[PDB]
Design a protein around this ligand. Sequence first.
Ligand SMILES: Nc1ncnc2c1ncn2[C@@H]1O[C@H](COP(=O)(O)OP(=O)(O)OP(=O)(O)O)[C@@H](O)[C@H]1O
Ligand SMILES: Nc1ncnc2c1ncn2[C@@H]1O[C@H](COP(=O)(O)OP(=O)(O)OP(=O)(O)O)[C@@H](O)[C@H]1O
Ligand SMILES: Nc1ncnc2c1ncn2[C@@H]1O[C@H](COP(=O)(O)OP(=O)(O)OP(=O)(O)O)[C@@H](O)[C@H]1O
Lengths: 709, 197, 70
Amino acid sequence: QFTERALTILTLAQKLASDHQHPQLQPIHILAAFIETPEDGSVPYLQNLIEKGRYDYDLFKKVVNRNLVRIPQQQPAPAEITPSYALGKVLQDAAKIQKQQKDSFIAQDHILFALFNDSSIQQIFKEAQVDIEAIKQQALELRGNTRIDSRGADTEYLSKYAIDMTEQARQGKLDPVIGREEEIRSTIRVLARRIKSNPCLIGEPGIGKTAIIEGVAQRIIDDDVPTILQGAKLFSLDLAALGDFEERFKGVLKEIEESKTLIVLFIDEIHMLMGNAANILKPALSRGQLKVIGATTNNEYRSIVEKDGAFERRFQKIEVAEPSVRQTVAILRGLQPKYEIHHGVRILDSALVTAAQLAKRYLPYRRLPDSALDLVDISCAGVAVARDSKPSMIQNVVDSDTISETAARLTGIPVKKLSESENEKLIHMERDLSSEVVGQMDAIKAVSNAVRLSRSGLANPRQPASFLFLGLSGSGKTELAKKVAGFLFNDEDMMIRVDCSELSEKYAVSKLLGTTYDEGGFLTNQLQYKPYSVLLFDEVEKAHPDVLTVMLQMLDDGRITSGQGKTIDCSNCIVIMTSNLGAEFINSQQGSKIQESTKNLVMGAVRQHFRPEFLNRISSIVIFNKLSRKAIHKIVDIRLKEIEERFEQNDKHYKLNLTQEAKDFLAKYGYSDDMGARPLNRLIQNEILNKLALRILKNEIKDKETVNV
Amino acid sequence: RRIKSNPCLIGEPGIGKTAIIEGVAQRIIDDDVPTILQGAKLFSLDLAALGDFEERFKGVLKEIEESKTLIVLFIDEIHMLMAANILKPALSRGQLKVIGATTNNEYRSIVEKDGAFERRFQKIEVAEPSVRQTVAILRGLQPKYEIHHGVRILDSALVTAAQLAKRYLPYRRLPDSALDLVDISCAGVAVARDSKP
Amino acid sequence: LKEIEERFEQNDKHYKLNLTQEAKDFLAKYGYSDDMGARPLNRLIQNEILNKLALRILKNEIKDKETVNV
Ligand SMILES: Nc1ncnc2c1ncn2[C@@H]1O[C@H](COP(=O)(O)OP(=O)(O)OP(=O)(O)O)[C@@H](O)[C@H]1O
Ligand SMILES: Nc1ncnc2c1ncn2[C@@H]1O[C@H](COP(=O)(O)OP(=O)(O)OP(=O)(O)O)[C@@H](O)[C@H]1O
Ligand SMILES: Nc1ncnc2c1ncn2[C@@H]1O[C@H](COP(=O)(O)OP(=O)(O)OP(=O)(O)O)[C@@H](O)[C@H]1O
């Protein structure tokens, strides 16, 4: 049978003679049918074995329809009714070159091939089809083995799913990477390994991977590529193949294996045991040939590369990281011109630098190039959305709104996102938290100090903020942090909550595990979710050798392995420990005894329950000794500030009066010895609230009123 | 051995267990192969299974039986319940010299059950080769992989490689890791060579 | 001093360090404890010496790459 691809033309050639309803099928017909248009999508134009063999079809595009319009017109049924064995031989005559060029069926060349006599301009000036001269010539150029089956695609499956940068690179489409140079170099090195050509990326994507692969191919097109693979080039797959599929995917593989290291493929995350398939090219890469390039993320890697280990033996992973904050500045400087000229605008460095500078911090997820630029275009958008919408004079993007607004366009509290020198939070936080919490100047000092140390990087950049805090319940410990992060992270929720009393034995499981049940996670599940965080650990003497040991890393390095195994940075985060041990020994501050004394009195107790090294891990440890009823009542209006916060504000507009009496009554009844003022909240929750709450609809209070009990 | 022709190569993979089979395959064309073993040659099935697609692997048992033990088979780390069980009905026909191999792992699993299919199998465990082993292959393959990479090396390095390599190798079979580090060393500065300075 | 310079003067700041036995006796004397040795002094230095700079860092009256002993 004829090749479908051939027959696709052939019937379309029968269709060709049908459209003008030709009387007969005659040599010069399909010269039009071979060609939809001059596109190499019609190979008989340029990619034809003749244009390369003998007769170029460019102007020779001219004459084909000239005949088929000058054929004597016919009617529908006699159209394509005849093979007209003069042409009808081409049916058989196409089987002649399948001999000398070694083919079986009758292909696009063959249907073409047979035509080489009269299908033409045959004259004194003959623009025609040379007989053996173009094809056997270029039927090796084309192909070199053509024959497979009537079925199949064009008779170059490459350009289907092979998308090449070097094209775009020599085109200059893509954006030059920054700083991945040695990373490129590293890979390229690996790319020079006969054992593992395969470099492999791990990390979080959006990170420059195929751009790395650009710099890769960039080094090809500028011949920064060293000798071996200079002749080689780049490809990268399209998953776009969508009959069955992998078989197709197999096609190029042979082809590229035939292609003889003049190109290289690039795949990104998708390296797959297919669910319902198997290993394709996994053998053909196991074929010990065919330079290829890998990448993925962690457990994906864990999954596939280990379940073989010859993937391991084929793949050498080189894991890039989210770059040092300053890098993207360059790629920003790279893309500064870009999107502003996309968005018809300008950029100030002030925001430009700032973008990452913050989005590093307060953006949870994305990548130094990514996350920043994400802001940018979006920042770029609104300002242009303003400009290209009406309130322009802004063209450059200046820090504040372009950042903080746009930042707060994620979050809020921009003025903080605006103001902080990141140092200033040091200097004034004491008084700041002093406004939040009274006394415990130690905590005021040390925690600040410690965190004043936690940044400025005086010690290991990987190293946590290690806090065991003590006192009574209701002592503002939780608040402290909640303030701290609230101060620091502009939020409380960085706080993360594990009572050490929760789980006695296996919690190591319940934080994380290589999961069999499968736990999505716990700790990191929050913290890997929340990279800037605070860690509350509670009754740590009831933290068990289960957990307190993995505290060691948790006390180390501020970077924590996962159950899936990944290490997760806590050095950006805080950790908080508490105990009831010397809450007795707080009976010292009952007599207001020397705390350092009773510290020692307490210190042993925790020192008893734990390992000094585990303790020497701690930046510092502090007790809350109970503090003045002054301090107690000093809480109150403050405790009431957080009352009125919304209340007189976003609804009531309720002016507020207070009887020192009740305030004292509160100051009397608000503080509990054991419980601190933790009642006071719930206290105020009642009489203050409800009498207020009651009078509300009772309308003696209206807006702007003030009545205390 | 007429009694147990089938070996079981035991050991952790990456050690050269089919590099064994390499020179073995060579001894076939080197013609040191014993009279018992002369007429046979090397087949080694690297199993790609891709209606049952396996019975192919079973149908070939006749194709070698066609040749009538005119070859040998070698399977490397795949020794497991197949379809059903791997191999034997041709071997269990009494026929079919095969080169068996495994880690103790796959040795710990199915062949623990019967043990009388290992009735064909002497289990031989490879040990991570000595320094000269690495050295000598390096000695042989230093010029190889420097010409594979089109470069040159100091044999001074070459032996010195194995030294710390063997010393501080946390994991692998040294020559690999060596050849790795070698190729690493090779390609690394070769890539540094082929790419300007 | 090593584990000081390892970070400031090495892996981050490139900030020089100087001391005197004046301050070091103002340390080691207190810095040494009988049973635990100077293991106290390590976690001692952690602020009043360290954070004295973490103070001075943004207090900045004198800057990085300098050194001033107390
Ligand atoms: N060095 C870089 N040069 C150019 N673009 C970069 C670079 N680093 C990151 N990018 C940008 O961030 C993304 C990273 O692209 P690339 O694929 O190369 O890395 P990636 O991690 O694979 O991104 P993706 O996750 O979509 O695969 C792209 O949007 C790219 O424009
Ligand atoms: N010095 C203080 N300054 C401000 N608020 C304080 C102070 N001491 C205690 N509080 C208040 O005490 C309450 C509870 O404090 P604390 O952190 O001790 O509770 P906790 O840590 O959650 O354990 P629990 O709440 O059960 O006592 C909060 O309302 C907090 O504001
Ligand atoms: N002594 C040697 N001489 C030459 N090449 C060797 C030698 N040992 C190992 N090799 C090389 O090691 C590679 C393959 O090693 P080989 O597969 O034999 O290790 P392996 O332990 O058998 O792994 P597996 O157990 O899965 O079969 C080849 O490139 C081969 O040339």
